[PDB]
């Protein structure tokens, strides 16, 4: 099926994004980057790959914050080009990548308005992937109720609020409940969208989204114990896409401690190995580190087929991990904390 139609609209961008993927840093490149003794040495190594001149025309008293910002700037430009060149099926899919950032940007807008801050103060600080089309919400910035209706009118995200959150819920609930509530509706809506793109996009992007549901339910549970969240709150936040949903998800909702969470993980061999591989002891990889390491593994596996949209999601996530890695190497080096520097996640 997809092999016949897919190239007609996407063969160029499929070749382009795989071409950009080939530009990511090898394990050997990270092993060179960690030998550096200043940000200028990182610049000289990064100069040997696609990051060449990304830090040119910038202040000689260099800072790790600038490197982070320039890495994101490059990633944003790359993503914008692919989104600008796309046609409706891919374009809609690439918009589903953007929604993950858009949600966090809207969380800022709401947070600022709940503290009566002008949204014009917040917009320069937002993740530039999640940039708005319509701006009346940003321009008005008057009240949480005005923002809620303005978001609903202006934003691609608006449908997700209608699935889960009223104006009264926005006044009553904590913003972190709101953050996760939107993500529940988002993962389910994007998972349905991937299954509507039947064949290779479904069978390669669904594994990643299923892990994104499972990872959220695990992390939310192990973080919920020391909190006022009820069992009903945990349940109301868990995404239904994951292999947990038929039973283990409800068991995580009923559970409250690491041992019980591990007893859920112990039913599924991947998650069993992940928990066994992380006690979170001093110098250990943590449960969250193992999940990110696995998330990369799944994203690499999406590149093991030639024609499906899954590579665009995996690309953005992997480039985000490459930024996390280069910043972490730069932070270790700037702080002289070499002893833990190897904790970056290798990618390709």
């Amino acid at each position: 099926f997809p092999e016949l139609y897919f190239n007609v609209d996407n063969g160029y961008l499929e070749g382009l994004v795989r071409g950009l993927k080939a530009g990511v840093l090898s394990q050997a490149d990270y092993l060179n980057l960690v030998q550096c003794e200043t940000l200028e040495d990182l610049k000289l190594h990064l100069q040997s790959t696609d990051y060449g001149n990304f830090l040119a025309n910038e202040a000689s008293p260099l800072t790790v914050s600038v490197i982070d910002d320039k890495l994101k700037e490059k990633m944003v430009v790359e993503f914008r080009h692919m989104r600008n060149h796309a046609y409706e099926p891919l374009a809609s899919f690439l918009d589903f990548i953007t929604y993950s950032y858009m949600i966090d940007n809207v969380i800022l807008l709401i947070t600022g308005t709940l503290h009566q801050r002008s949204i014009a103060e917040l917009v320069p600080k937002c993740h530039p992937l999640g940039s708005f089309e319509q701006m009346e919400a940003v321009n008005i910035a008057q009240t949480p109720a005005e923002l809620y209706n303005a978001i609903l009118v202006d934003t691609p995200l608006a449908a997700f609020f209608q699935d889960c959150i009223s104006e009264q819920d926005l006044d009553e609930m904590n913003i972190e409940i709101i953050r996760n509530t939107l993500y529940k509706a988002y993962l389910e809506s994007f998972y349905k969208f991937c299954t509507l793109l039947g064949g290779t996009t479904a069978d390669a992007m669904c594994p990643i989204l299923e892990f994104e549901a499972d990872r959220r339910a695990f992390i939310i549970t192990i973080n919920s114990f020391g909190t006022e969240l009820s069992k009903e709150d945990r349940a109301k936040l868990f995404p239904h896409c994951g292999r947990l949903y038929p039973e283990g998800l409800a068991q995580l909702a009923r559970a409250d401690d690491y041992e019980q969470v591990k007893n859920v993980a112990d039913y599924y061999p991947e998650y069993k190995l992940l928990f066994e591989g992380a006690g979170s002891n001093p110098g250990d990889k943590t449960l969250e580190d193992r999940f990110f390491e696995h998330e990369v593994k799944l994203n690499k596996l999406a590149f093991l087929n030639q024609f499906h949209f899954g590579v665009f999601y995996a690309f953005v996530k992997l480039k985000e991990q490459e930024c996390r890695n280069i910043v972490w190497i730069a932070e270790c080096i700037a702080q002289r904390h070499r002893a833990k520097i190897d904790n970056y996640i290798p990618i390709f």
Binding site: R243, P246, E247, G248, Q251, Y267, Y268
Partner: peptide, 10 residues
């Protein structure tokens, strides 16, 4: 398909 899926925790 259902049986296979359920048996994981059963």
């Amino acid at each position: 398909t259902g049986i296979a899926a359920m048996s994981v925790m059963r």
